[PDB]
Amino acid sequence: QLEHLQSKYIGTGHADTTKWEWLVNQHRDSYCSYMGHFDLLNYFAIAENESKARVRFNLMEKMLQPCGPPA
């Protein structure tokens, strides 16, 4: 079977995947990638008059449950 590799990696869906868990992973991946690039955080810290530490803290806090509660 070729599904061994696809199972050990989180975020992998199946035929019974609901939209909510797809969108929450989509938002979580974007939140994680925001802190990676330095200029992608400079743009956020210049757009709103805040500090880099504050933006990072807010992004980390928002990861607990993005896209609202489930159904």
Binding site: G11, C32, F38, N42, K52, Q65
Partner: protein
């Protein structure tokens, strides 16, 4: 069409900083990492300035940076975790002046994924293990060790995976010769995704988990995990073991907590609060960075808040238990991202936005006047800020990090366009002016009537440290002077200077020889004159002076040979030569202490042929090599330190040739059809050349690289070296029929900057096409205007007076007459949806505002332009787009307004005329055909001038998303969307209808665009990609557009312009990054060069892997595959390897390393 990516200025954005003994001796260096550039720099403990030693590129973003040393060692290593997906350990090699790859381990895929270690990196303080952890579920631990080979070793990684876990910070606990222990902040979220009621989202605490590394069983297990009360952001390690207690210093919101494993209480000391804060009293207070000054005698800590206030944390304990934490306000500094407490009382502060400072510590803060806080006091503390009184500023590093707009234009009376960048953010914003050349410093100005043409400055003795001799020579007259900081007329020189002076030689240790057209007169320091008269009607032409010999030539080519003796007597040879031309240009090299004299002499003639004559009397007066020149040389000079020679021609070109009796490498470059003179100068204790033309030129040799950079100054004709005590290093130069003094302090670089202070962050600006002025506008979130802040302060300082106590409240009087500055003390960030905008007009020549317009609250300026309509004559209207009640994250507004000014009296007045209300925020304003295009969000409209408002002519609603850019050319205009790449819409004036015909396929987060000639739009992206889109030739002006170029710079770009940079250059594609980098996208000219460049790049892709280790092709294809672009940084990196590797790379292309280097420099020196 292929493009070549060069670079002009490197990024100056600091993200991480570490300190340690990276060299080996007892001197500490700083390794500062840019966004994707690794840099090394050290400060001078004797003067305080900081120099640059290495600027190697890693070709990839860096997410972590740590330093460590082994037990019982004296060298510090560097551990780098980045996007490469590997772990790299470096080592600095002082002998090779470059880094050294040591270890490389792969533990996953590539890319900033979720489950990929590399974000958080921690190291054991004792230097026995290292932990690299991801943001979730991918904790990994290595085991570092040393073997009998005295080399670092890496064992197999140990997994510490834990599903459904978010990691906030990872730090290494200090333990004295026990098993390593690491701390992390986990927070499970499994229960938060199973309760639809949402009650599990709240009341979920995070734990402080300690991880135990079993050094005997080779596994890692977690032991302690206790819940916390409130969320924290970062942790500070405490030196433990045998010197102090072991634990952590969790810095939560509005609190600081100390926790230790086992049985130990907790200490919570609230953070001190600024006195009489003007902001909203519902905003939390958190820390941003920390430091450590661990010392065997006593140790303390440092911290910094959002407002940039340094504290001083000191712990109190008896044997192991910590009793209290004692805070104390230290100083106030601009907010920084990292600090490095250096030895010898030095502090390095690297600001996240602006220049970088460096302070020295005079007092450690003992027995001060302000009280100290503690956790023992029951129950909201306060303190009063003040000037520093504890630190002084000794050095500042320039950095144009937050650049938001750029515009290249020529506004002064020259031909080289200047750069007008609008950088900075917050109250400390500035608008610098960048021009090619070096910084010019002056000390004193003196008036010397007449017509001088030359001057000399030679030391009286070889052991003298102060220059004394000055020989100011007119066309025929002379005037001896001196420098003693009291420069006046001197008479007791006794030179009998009644004849024109052509040189001032140094024949011996202190012997000087003057030149007069009637012979040669020796002038010794002692009364020993050896005068040699030359009878006849023919005078001398020139003289080749040297530290040990003198060579002279007469009219018609009559050679005279001179050679000195140890006794101190002159000598002459009995042979005279015949020439086929006349003496025009001479040169002579220096003598090293390791040899008796030089090797060869260079002689120039009218026939444009250089003649090489040996100094050996056995075969003297005998040419060896012959080489003609395209044009007649004017002056010649020789530089030392591998040695090269400089050839100056009659026109404005300078030729570089390696030192060789036979002809060799040739380096042709332009210096303006005027004579060029080259003299010997001194820099930082090193030799250099100096060419003079219509503009001054300075060339220096440093680390196998030559830079021919001009000086940002007016026309000059003469210069000479200078060194004294008042100035660290200067240059004695003359001016137009007068005297001057020149000084150079800054290290060799380009793009000199002059800073103009501002008040807020500049968004956009335009240039007046008649009076060359600026219409700069500003807008910042979370700010108060000049009136609202004042009225809020007045209202606040009135209710507190009536606090039912002593009527005797006189502090309001002492408070209302003293306001702290904002450029050093920050700004009072208040609110969540507040705005402030200012419109400013500035003179680009010198900094002085002409008019200021202040908008009211909740009014954000987003666009400005200058237009001229048709129904009205020469009336330069100014339109400003203003929003209303703009909230960022829950985006929702209630309309906006558009202003209209008049700009009367040739550019220093502005009267309000009328305003027009709009139901949506405008973002794009573009004038064309005597009208204006207004893009109000999704809607697109065209407006016309009226009497009290603006008239809506045509309406189109087809844009899929928010409009954020509009450019007009001819009958075609381009609308820049926020998600779609581009939309082409044509305006027809027959029925007043806008129709869309062409669009793009791949969505892009476009931020800026610029049409090249007529159809190719050189766009950009929010992530860093740069693309060029071209319309098919067969389009009916449904119809997509093809893409002809793709690239990935790796940094956000917000500026694109095509304009020639140097006189006689070509059309470039100069852009500007968001970190401070300036680059160009110049194309290739011929076809036989593109293949060579592609071959060189392909060979270096495998013969020179990146320092971090990552596929260069994959890095440049981060989001979209590369297309028709060749990297130029990698090609220019060819100049720095080992000779064997250089030969191995060069031999496939059947070329020599000098041949490859010459054209690599030639292509760069032609377009810029």
């Amino acid at each position: 069409m292929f493009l070549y990516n060069l670079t002009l200025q490197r990024a100056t954005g600091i993200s991480f900083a570490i300190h340690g003994n990276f060299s080996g001796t007892k001197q500490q260096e700083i390794v500062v990492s840019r966004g994707k550039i690794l840099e090394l720099l050290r400060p001078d403990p004797n003067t305080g300035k900081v120099h640059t030693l290495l600027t190697v590129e890693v070709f990839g973003v860096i997410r972590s940076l740590m330093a460590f040393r082994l037990t019982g060692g004296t060298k510090d290593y560097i551990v780098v975790g980045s996007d490469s997906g590997r772990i790299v350990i470096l080592e600095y090699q002082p002998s090779k002046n470059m880094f050294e790859k040591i270890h490389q381990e792969t533990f996953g895929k590539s890319g900033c994924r979720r489950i990929v270690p590399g974000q958080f990196l921690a190291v054991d303080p004792k230097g026995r293990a290292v932990m690299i952890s991801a943001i979730e579920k991918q904790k990994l631990v290595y085991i570092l060790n040393r073997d009998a080979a005295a080399r670092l070793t890496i064992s197999s990684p140990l997994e510490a995976h834990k599903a459904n876990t978010l990691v906030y910070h990872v730090v290494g606990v200090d333990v004295g010769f026990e098993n390593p222990m690491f701390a992390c902040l986990e927070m499970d979220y499994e229960e938060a995704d199973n309760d639809p009621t949402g009650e599990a989202a709240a009341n979920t605490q995070q734990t402080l988990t300690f991880y135990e590394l079993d050094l005997g069983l080779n596994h890692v297990v977690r032991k302690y995990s206790e819940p916390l009360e409130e969320h924290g952001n970062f942790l500070i390690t405490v030196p433990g073991g045998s010197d102090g207690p072991s634990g952590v210093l969790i810095c939560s919101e509005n609190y600081i907590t100390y926790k230790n494993f086992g049985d130990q209480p907790d200490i919570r000391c609230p953070i001190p609060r600024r006195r009489n804060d003007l902001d909203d009293p519902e905003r939390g207070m958190i820390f941003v960075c920390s430091a450590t000054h661990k010392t065997k005698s006593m140790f303390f800590f440092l911290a910094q808040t959002e407002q940039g206030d340094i504290f001083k944390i000191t712990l109190e304990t008896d044997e192991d238990m910590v009793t209290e934490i004692r805070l104390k306000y230290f100083d106030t500094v601009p907010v920084a991202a990292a600090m490095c407490v250096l030895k010898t009382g030095f502090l390095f502060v690297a600001s996240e936005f602006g220049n970088h400072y460096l302070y020295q510590i005079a007092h450690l803060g003992d027995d001060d006047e302000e009280p100290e806080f503690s956790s023992a006091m029951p129950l909201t503390f306060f303190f009063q800020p003040r000037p520093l009184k504890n630190l002084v500023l000794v050095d500042e590093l320039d950095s144009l990090s937050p650049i938001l707009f750029c515009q290249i234009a020529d506004l002064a009376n020259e031909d080289t366009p200047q750069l007008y960048v609008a950088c900075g953010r917050g109250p400390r914003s500035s608008l610098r002016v960048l021009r090619h050349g070096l910084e010019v410093s002056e000390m004193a100005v003196s008036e010397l009537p007449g017509n001088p043409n030359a001057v000399w400055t030679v030391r009286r003795h070889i052991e003298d440290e102060f220059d004394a001799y000055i020989i100011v020579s007119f066309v025929n007259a002379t005037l001896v002077l001196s420098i003693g900081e009291t420069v006046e007329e001197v008479t007791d020189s006794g030179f009998l200077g009644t004849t024109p002076t052509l040189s001032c030689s140094l024949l011996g240790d202190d012997a000087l020889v003057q030149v007069y057209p009637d012979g040669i007169r020796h002038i010794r320091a002692d009364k020993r004159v050896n005068e040699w008269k030359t009878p006849g009607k023919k005078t001398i032409v020139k003289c080749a002076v040297n530290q040990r010999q003198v060579v002279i030539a007469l009219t018609g080519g009559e050679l005279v040979y001179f050679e000195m003796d140890p006794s101190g007597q002159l000598n002459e040879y009995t042979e005279r030569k015949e020439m086929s031309a006349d003496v025009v240009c001479m040169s002579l090299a220096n003598v090293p202490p390791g040899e008796q004299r030089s090797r060869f002499l260079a002689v120039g003639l009218v026939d444009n042929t250089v003649r090489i004559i040996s100094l050996d009397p056995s075969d003297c007066l005998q040419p060896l090599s012959m080489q003609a020149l395209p044009a007649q040389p004017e002056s010649l000079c020789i530089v030392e330190m591998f040695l090269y020679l400089n050839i100056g021609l009659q026109n404005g070109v300078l030729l570089r040739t390696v030192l060789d009796p036979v002809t060799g490498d040739l380096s042709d470059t332009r210096t303006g059809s005027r004579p060029v003179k080259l003299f010997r100068v001194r820099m930082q204790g090193q030799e250099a050349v100096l060419a003079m033309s219509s503009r001054s030129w300075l060339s220096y040799s440093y680390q196998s690289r030559f830079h021919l950079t001009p000086l940002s100054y007016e026309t000059l004709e003469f210069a000479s070296g200078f060194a004294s005590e008042q100035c660290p290093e200067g240059i004695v130069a003359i001016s137009t029929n007068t005297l001057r003094i020149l000084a150079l302090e800054k290290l060799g670089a380009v793009f000199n900057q002059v800073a103009f202070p501002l008040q807020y962050t500049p968004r956009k600006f335009v240039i007046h096409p008649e009076s060359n002025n600026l219409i700069i506008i500003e807008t910042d979130h979370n700010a108060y205007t000049e009136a609202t802040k004042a009225q809020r302060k007045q209202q606040m300082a009135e209710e507190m007076v009536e606090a039912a106590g002593e009527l005797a409240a006189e502090m309001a009087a002492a408070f209302l007459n003293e306001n702290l500055p904002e450029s050093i003390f920050g700004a009072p960030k208040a609110g969540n949806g507040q705005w402030a905008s200012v419109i400013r007009v500035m003179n680009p020549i010198q900094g002085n505002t002409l008019d200021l317009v202040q908008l009211e609250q909740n009014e954000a300026a987003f666009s400005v332009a200058v237009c001229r309509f048709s129904n009205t004559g020469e009336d330069w209207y100014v339109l400003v787009g203003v929003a209303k009640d703009l909230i960022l994250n829950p985006r929702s507004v209630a309309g906006g307004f558009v202003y209209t000014y008049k700009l009367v009296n040739n550019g220093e007045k502005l009267e309000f005329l009328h305003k027009t209300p709009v139901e949506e925020v405008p973002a794009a304003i573009a004038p064309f055909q005597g009208r204006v295009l207004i893009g109000v969000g999704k809607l697109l409209r065209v407006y016309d001038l009226g009497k009290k408002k603006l008239l809506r002519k045509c309406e189109n609603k087809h844009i899929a998303n928010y409009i954020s850019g509009i450019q007009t050319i001819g009958h075609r205009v381009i609308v820049s969307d926020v998600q779609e790449s581009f939309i082409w819409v044509r305006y027809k004036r027959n029925e007043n209808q806008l129709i869309i015909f062409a669009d793009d396929t791949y969505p892009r987060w476009v931020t800026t665009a610029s049409l090249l000639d007529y159809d190719t739009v050189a766009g950009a992206d929010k992530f860093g990609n740069i693309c060029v889109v071209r319309l098919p030739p067969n389009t009916n002006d449904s119809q997509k557009a093809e893409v002809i170029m793709n690239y990935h710079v790796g940094e956000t770009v917000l500026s694109l312009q095509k304009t020639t940079l140097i006189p006689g250059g070509s059309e470039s594609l100069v852009y500007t990054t968001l970190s401070g980098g300036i680059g160009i996208l110049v194309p290739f000219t011929s076809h036989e060069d593109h293949d060579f460049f592609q071959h060189v790049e392909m060979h270096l892709r495998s013969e020179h892997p990146p320092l971090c280790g990552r596929d260069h092709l994959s890095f440049r294809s981060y989001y979209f595959p590369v297309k028709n672009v060749i990297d130029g940084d990698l090609c220019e990196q060819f100049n720095s390897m080992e000779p064997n590797k250089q030969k191995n790379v060069s031999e496939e292309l059947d070329r020599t390393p000098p041949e490859v280097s010459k054209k690599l420099e030639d292509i760069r020196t032609r377009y810029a």
